[PDB]
């Protein structure tokens, strides 16, 4: 009963030739109309959104806190001697900072020299297209001392006492608001509370906090945070080649051959947290410099 393939009275795979053409023609017209309808409705959907602003922005309320070595498990395990052991780290650091070189930021028509001191927020009008392409404040690698250097094509980083820079999740129209001068116990921090988003790293328990001896932060003018002169963001369409602020963190006195947990928590009023998302506001890392 399963050899209905053909017969002398015509049938192929189950039906005749003239029937195969009728069904195929119908399905082609039917699916063609379905495709045109889906495309037309998806076009109306495209007409309901603008080019300079996402309609819903509540799902990114607390900005994240990422790092340069996008580790497979937020762990930094390498050998201070073997150059190939830490190649995966350095490669990502050089590629990340490849757009921050002095040669990359050379056009004066799209770049603006903000300043050597963190200042107030820089609002470039409204988010519409009435104004031309906004300017992006420059951020030279020299701001991150001891984690930038004037190295060649390969940034010879720190083998012993590694460097891990932090970055604030780029959000459109987000205006960072650092904590009030009434700081509710934010550990040792500089008095430059009004024009920089503070970020403080620490261990996770009584063990990690003891293993991590000394940490040295690097930022704009020497402040451990992000300057307010670089915010808010005006989208990729209006501000291409934008350079969000960066801030490096070096762990000088570490206990070699020991995996220790570090939690870099960014503080501020407009910075939320989440017990489910360990990246919203805070940031974790598992460093282990095994010799």
């Amino acid at each position: 009963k399963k050899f209905i393939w053909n017969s002398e009275k015509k049938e192929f795979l189950g039906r005749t030739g003239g029937s195969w053409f009728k069904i195929l023609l119908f399905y082609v017209i039917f699916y063609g109309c379905l495709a045109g309808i889906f495309i037309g409705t998806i076009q109306v959907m495209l007409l309901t959104i603008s080019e300079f602003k996402p309609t819903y922005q509540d799902r990114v309320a607390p900005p994240g806190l990422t790092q340069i070595p996008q580790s497979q498990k937020t762990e930094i395990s390498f050998r201070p001697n073997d150059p190939q052991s830490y190649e995966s780290y350095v490669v990502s650091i050089v590629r990340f900072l490849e757009k921050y070189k002095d040669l990359a930021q050379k056009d004066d028509m799209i770049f603006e020299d903000c300043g050597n001191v963190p200042s107030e927020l820089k609002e470039r009008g409204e988010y519409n297209n009435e104004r031309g392409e906004r300017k992006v404040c420059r951020f030279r690698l020299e701001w991150l001392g001891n984690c930038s250097g004037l190295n060649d094509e390969t940034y010879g980083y720190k083998d012993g006492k590694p460097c891990v820079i932090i970055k604030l999740n780029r959000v459109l129209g987000f205006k960072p608001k650092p904590p009030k001068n009434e700081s509710l116990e934010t550990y040792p921090v500089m008095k430059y509370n009004p024009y920089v988003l503070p970020v403080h790293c620490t261990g996770k328990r009584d063990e990690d906090k003891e293993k991590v001896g000394t940490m040295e932060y690097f930022g704009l003018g020497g402040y451990p945070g992000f300057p307010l002169q670089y915010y808010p963001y005006y989208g990729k369409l209006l501000q291409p080649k934008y350079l969000q602020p960066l801030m490096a963190v070096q762990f000088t006195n570490l206990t070699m051959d020991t995996e220790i947990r570090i939690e870099c928590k960014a503080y501020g009023e407009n910075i939320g947290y989440s017990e489910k998302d360990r990246f919203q506001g805070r940031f974790d890392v598992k460093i282990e410099v095994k010799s």
Binding site: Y56, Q57, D58, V60, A61, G173, F174
Partner: protein
């Protein structure tokens, strides 16, 4: 701020809708 959504009012409205539609359906299958 545009970084906030009144999820409690929408959630509350959805739960009231779910309650009313179910009790109405129960009245539908109880024709008396």
């Amino acid at each position: 701020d545009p970084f906030y959504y009144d999820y409690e009012t929408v959630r509350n409205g959805g739960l009231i809708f779910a309650a009313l539609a179910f009790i109405v359906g129960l009245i539908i299958i109880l024709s008396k």
